[PDB]
Design a protein around this nucleic acid. Structure first.
Ligand SMILES: [Mg+2]
Lengths: 225, 215
RNA sequence: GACGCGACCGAAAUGGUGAAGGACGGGUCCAGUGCGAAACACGCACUGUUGAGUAGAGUGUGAGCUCCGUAACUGGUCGCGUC
């Protein structure tokens, strides 16, 4: 019954500002400490800030002090993180977390939201180009062919990839995106399939990049000789 | 001084049923104000242990925490399949609060060599002036693997990026993609494009290659 | 010995006075632990080994005690009066 939902993430340019919110339900934030914790992609958890009940005392990590402000609006049962002078290194999933009740769980953070992604970058929103990774005109390695789609040069995260509108899941590997030196992301999704089906089975990669209004489907077939 | 929480090991491989211990060493006294969290890929962390040794409500008793001075341990007495995850310690003794760096607990299995595939750039991409060459290493174990790109037998350096999947929930293997990026002009100046792979499960290096503009 | 008067002593009490710091306490101060939906701030409880400046980091006509007084008395002693 206890839930936290963070919102307000998205893309911002270096030096810009962004306000995150953390909407609580199933409890009243006035009786709890509320914390913000962030996680850069592929990295660990980093404590950001907290606000104490009854006093309103606020505390900040050295890395954000003077730039971030935590606050609470009890009439919306919502906590906020105002982020100013943002830098590329502030790119992260931002979680809000409730510190639980002292008698029940000490100072542990007993409930966490799902997180909201904040991307700080001078790159502009851009949809991917989707290119086929065609099954090789030889036979194949093992007994199975491999094919895929290359999802190149999009911004920001995330994109979703499926195969055959979700029907094909076995043997699918969709790789974590890499940030290229251009500032754009790229990833590939591959699937291993029987080589004997390459000319009669249909393989379509479905790519959706909601920030750029880019949704495409690419049929991946063998080429010529 | 901020309190440092030094967490070890950064990762460990274990079998279902094994007893494993994860350690967090604080840089000053934190009394017993230490919590442990579990986090699965793409998901929010979940509280396991609070106040160093107290089991959080609803957590299975195979999870335990212990305090030895300023050294803290999380033990899983018998790993179950749902326990493979990343674990984090956290001190709440003083502000600013501090997390340890995390320990990823992965599932041990038998060595499996990769299946290797190379993909030339599509004719569609070449139209735009860039060539991406992709090498796939499929379903291998352990995670350690070396991919080298050769262009007309010259070893490349600095112009590729790699990505690795999470351990597969079924067969417990990894897969890896390596992408070599060249301008179209550079790509068309050479013929043979090769991906050379070394892995524990391979008795000798494996090369997959294509000739530019061939089938 | 009784009644009576006085002085001296004692004296419950009391006006003023000024030293003592954690072994007089505290609604003094500091710290720690727990509790209050509560890490700080606020409140309560508890534990503190130079906890800790003796009259103030105090806005106690605080207790006790020192020193100078005063003193109920239905206490003692001595003198004197009457028998
Ligand atoms: Mg307090």
């Amino acid at each position: 019954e206890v839930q936290l939902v963070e919102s307000g993430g998205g893309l911002v340019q270096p030096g810009g500002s962004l306000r995150l919110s953390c909407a609580a339900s199933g409890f009243y934030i006035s009786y709890s400490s509320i914390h913000w914790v962030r996680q850069a992609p592929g990295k660990g958890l980093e404590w950001v800030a907290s606000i104490s009940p009854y006093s309103g005392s606020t505390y900040y990590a050295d890395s954000v002090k003077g730039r971030f402000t935590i606050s609470a609006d009890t009439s919306k049962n919502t906590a906020y993180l105002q982020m100013n002078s943002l830098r590329a290194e502030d790119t992260a999933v931002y979680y809000c977390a409730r510190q639980g009740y002292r008698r029940r769980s000490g100072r542990g953070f007993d409930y966490w939201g799902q997180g909201t992604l904040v991307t700080v970058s001078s790159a502009s929103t851009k949809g991917p180009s989707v290119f086929p990774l065609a099954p090789s005109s030889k036979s194949t390695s093992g007994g199975t062919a491999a094919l895929g789609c290359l999802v190149k040069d999009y911004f920001p995260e995330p994109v979703t990839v499926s195969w055959n509108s979700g029907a094909l899941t076995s043997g699918v590997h969709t790789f974590p995106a890499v940030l290229q030196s251009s500032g754009l992301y790229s990833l590939s999704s591959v699937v291993t399939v029987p080589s004997s089906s390459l000319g009669t089975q249909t393989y379509i990669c479905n790519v959706n990049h909601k920030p750029s209004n880019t949704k495409v489907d690419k049929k991946v077939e063998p080429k010529s000789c | 001084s901020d309190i440092q929480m030094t967490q070890s090991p950064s990762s460990l491989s274990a079998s279902v049923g094994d007893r494993v211990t994860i350690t967090c060493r604080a840089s000053q006294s934190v009394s017993s104000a230490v919590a442990w969290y579990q986090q699965k890929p793409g998901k929010a962390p979940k509280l396991l242990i609070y106040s160093a040794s107290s089991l959080y409500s609803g957590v299975p008793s195979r999870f335990s925490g212990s305090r030895s001075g300023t050294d803290f341990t999380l033990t899983i007495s018998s790993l179950q399949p749902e326990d493979f995850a990343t674990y984090y310690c956290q001190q709440s003794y003083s502000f600013p609060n501090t997390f340890g760096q995390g320990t990823k607990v992965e599932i041990k299995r038998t060595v499996a060599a990769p299946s290797v595939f190379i993909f030339p750039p599509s004719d569609e991409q070449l139209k735009s002036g860039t060539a991406s060459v992709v090498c796939l290493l499929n379903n291998f174990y352990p995670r350690e693997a070396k991919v080298q790109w050769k262009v007309d037998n010259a070893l490349q350096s600095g112009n590729s990026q790699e990505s690795v999947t999470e351990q597969d929930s079924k067969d417990s293997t990894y897969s890896l993609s390596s992408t070599l990026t060249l301008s179209k002009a550079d790509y068309e100046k050479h013929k043979v494009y090769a991906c050379e792979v070394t892995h524990q499960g391979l008795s000798s290096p494996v090369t997959k290659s294509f000739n530019r503009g061939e089938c």
